[PDB]
A paper describes a structure:
The discovery of the bNAb VRC34.01, isolated from a chronically HIV-1-infected donor, identified the fusion peptide (FP) of the HIV-1 Env gp41 subunit as another specific target for broad immune recognition. A majority of VRC34.01’s total interactive surface area (55%) binds to solvent-exposed FP residues 512–519 at the N-terminus of gp41, while 26% of the surface co-recognizes glycan N88 on gp120. Trimer-bound VRC34.01 prevents Env subunits from entering into a co-receptor engagement conformation that is required for viral entry, leading to 50% neutralization breadth of 208 globally representative HIV-1 isolates. Structural analyses demonstrate that the improved paratope expands the FP binding groove to accommodate diverse FP sequences of different lengths while also recognizing the HIV-1 Env backbone.
Rational combinations of these top single-mutant variants further improved neutralization breadth, with a maximum 85% breadth on the 20-virus panel achieved for VH_E2K_T59F (also referred to as VRC34.01-Combo1, Kabat numbering VH_E2K_T59F). To determine the structural basis of increased breadth from Combo1’s E2K and T59F mutations, we determined the co-crystal structure of Combo1 Fab in complex with fusion peptide FP8_v1 (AVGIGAVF) and the cryo-EM structure of Combo1 Fab with the BG505 DS-SOSIP trimer. A Crystal structure of VRC34.01-Combo1 Fab in complex with fusion peptide variant FP8_v1. Super-imposed crystal structures of the Combo1 Fab and VRC34.01 Fab, both in complex with FP, showed how the F59HC substitution enhanced inter-chain hydrophobic interactions to W50HC and Y94HC, while also removing unfavorable interactions between the template T59HC hydroxyl group and I515 on the HIV-1 FP. The replacement of T59HC with bulky F pushed the side chain of Y94LC closer to FP, enabling the formation of a tighter H-bond with G514FP (3.2Å versus 3.6 Å). The representative electron density around critical residues W50HC, F59HC, Y94LC, V513FP, G514FP, and I515FP further suggested that Combo1 enhances FP affinity by supporting favorable electrostatic interactions with HIV-1 trimer. The T59FHC mutation in Combo1 and mm28 also energetically contributed to stabilization of the antibody itself by generating pi-pi stacking interactions with Y94LC and F59HC, thereby reducing the energy 4.96 and 4.55 kcal/mol for Combo1 and mm28, respectively (second column). Combo1 also showed six and twelve-fold better binding to v1 and v3F, respectively, compared to VRC34.01.
Numbering used by the authors:
A (entry chain H): 1 to 52, 52A, 53 to 82, 82A, 82B, 82C, 83 to 100, 100A, ...
B (entry chain L): 1 to 213
C (entry chain A): 512 to 519
The structure:
């Protein structure tokens, strides 16, 4: 029943600050030191610092001293991480984690928050352009055709992609987004289907980008040569 | 900063295999060391602390050794839920640091990719850019070389790849490679080709198209 | 190991 619940996703401009919260349930909040650890996409784990929730004493990792601040409010069992003067290298998932803290020393991180996504970028909110990846007779492989949608030039993450309003799930691969050099994200979602029924089956890619309140349904159909 | 060097960084294994992962610390850390498991989209989970004490709620097939600088984590008989990334961590001085991780993925028979190429849509070209997509579907192992050739010229720096996580059902990977060109550069050339090298292919497979056809 | 004080 020990749980740490963190605040929701954040998107910030360079130079701004972000305050992440972490609330403890199911154990005595002031009985265990609490760590903050971050993970950039595809990378390892980086320790930011820790706090004694009873006393408020902290040790901040040297590379973050004077920029990252840990505090707590015992009345609401909540710890806070304030990351200031943000740059794009601060993009990542931020976790709080309780230490077992036996003997009032570090032992191991035994309860973890669910993580808080922090994106730092100069980009502004933008919905995606959705382009068909059309199947072609020349691209037939055995009895299979591949088709899809390219979901390009959006910010921030995430987008959701479904096919035929969720009725088509077999053979679907929705790829992890890539951050383009422009600072906008892009991904493709593909599906393999029978080549035999390309003339009669319907394929609609449903793209939802909640940050821009954009919803797009894109028809994907075989290319016809005149 | 103390450096924790894990080896190997990547390991392929089968259910039932014994797996041994090493963590070497750049300075002595006594037994002030912990091990964690992490799965995609999840926080790490504590397995071992005090270098060799097993955390409550962790199966007994996990065990660890070491005092000082040379530490090892063993899974005696890998189970399906054990395919994950593993990290060591010290706490003997500041900053606390983690090893680079060891990703344990599941072995299966070699499977060649099915390869598909998609020219840019007419809609996108109207916008001033051209994306060419090459799809490698349901292959194993993960290592694959995708080369873009444009009128027989090898491309560099203008493509990005994305790979799925290993599939829970068939243990394969899929991969997209996207070549992005300005409309001006796209219109300079005629023949666009994606060339795929993979262990399951006796020779590289090329899929291509002619612009404007 | 490192510590950050008493918690009572």
């Amino acid at each position: 029943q020990k749980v740490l619940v963190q605040s929701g996703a954040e998107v910030k401009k360079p130079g701004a600050s972000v305050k992440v919260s972490c609330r403890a349930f199911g154990y005595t909040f002031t009985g265990n030191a609490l760590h903050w650890v971050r993970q950039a996409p595809g990378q390892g784990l980086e320790w930011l610092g820790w706090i004694n929730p009873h006393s408020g004493d902290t040790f901040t990792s040297q590379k973050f001293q004077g920029r990252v601040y840990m505090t707590r409010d015992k009345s609401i069992n909540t710890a806070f991480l304030d990351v200031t003067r943000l740059t794009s290298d601060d993009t990542g998932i931020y976790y709080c984690a309780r230490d077992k803290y036996y003997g009032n020393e570090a032992v191991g991180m035994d309860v973890w928050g669910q993580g808080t996504s922090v994106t730092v970028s100069s980009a502004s909110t933008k919905g995606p352009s959705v382009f068909p990846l059309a199947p072609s007779s020349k691209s037939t492989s055995g009895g299979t055709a591949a088709l899809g949608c390219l979901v390009k030039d959006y910010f921030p993450e995430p987008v959701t992609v479904s096919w035929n309003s969720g009725a088509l799930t077999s053979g679907v691969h929705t790829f992890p987004a890539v951050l383009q050099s422009s600072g906008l994200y892009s991904l493709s979602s593909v599906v393999t289907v029978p080549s035999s029924s390309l003339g009669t089956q319907t394929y609609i890619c449903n793209v939802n980008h909640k940050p821009s309140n954009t919803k797009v349904d894109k028809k994907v159909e075989p290319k016809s040569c005149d | 900063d103390i450096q924790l060097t894990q080896s190997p960084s990547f390991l392929s294994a089968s259910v039932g295999d014994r797996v041994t992962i090493t963590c070497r610390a750049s300075q002595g850390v006594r037994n002030e060391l912990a091990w964690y498991q992490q799965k995609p989209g999840k926080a790490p989970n504590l397995l071992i602390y005090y270098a060799s004490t097993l955390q409550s709620g962790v199966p007994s097939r996990f065990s660890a050794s070491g005092s000082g600088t040379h530490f090892t984590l063993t899974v005696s008989s890998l189970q399906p839920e054990d395919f994950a990334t593993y990290f060591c961590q010290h706490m003997s001085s500041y900053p606390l640091t983690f090893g680079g991780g060891t990703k344990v993925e599941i072995k299966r028979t070699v499977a060649a990719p099915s390869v598909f190429i998609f020219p840019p849509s007419d809609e996108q070209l109207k916008s001033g850019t051209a994306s060419v997509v090459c799809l490698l579907n349901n292959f194993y192992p993960r290592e694959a070389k995708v080369q873009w050739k444009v009128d027989n010229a090898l491309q560099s720096g203008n493509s990005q790849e994305s790979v799925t996580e290993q599939d829970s059902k068939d243990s394969t990977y899929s991969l997209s490679s996207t070549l992005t060109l300005s409309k001006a550069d796209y219109e300079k050339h005629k023949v666009y080709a994606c060339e795929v090298t993979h262990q399951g292919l006796s020779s590289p497979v090329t899929k291509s198209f002619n612009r404007g056809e | 190991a490192v510590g950050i004080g008493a918690v009572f």
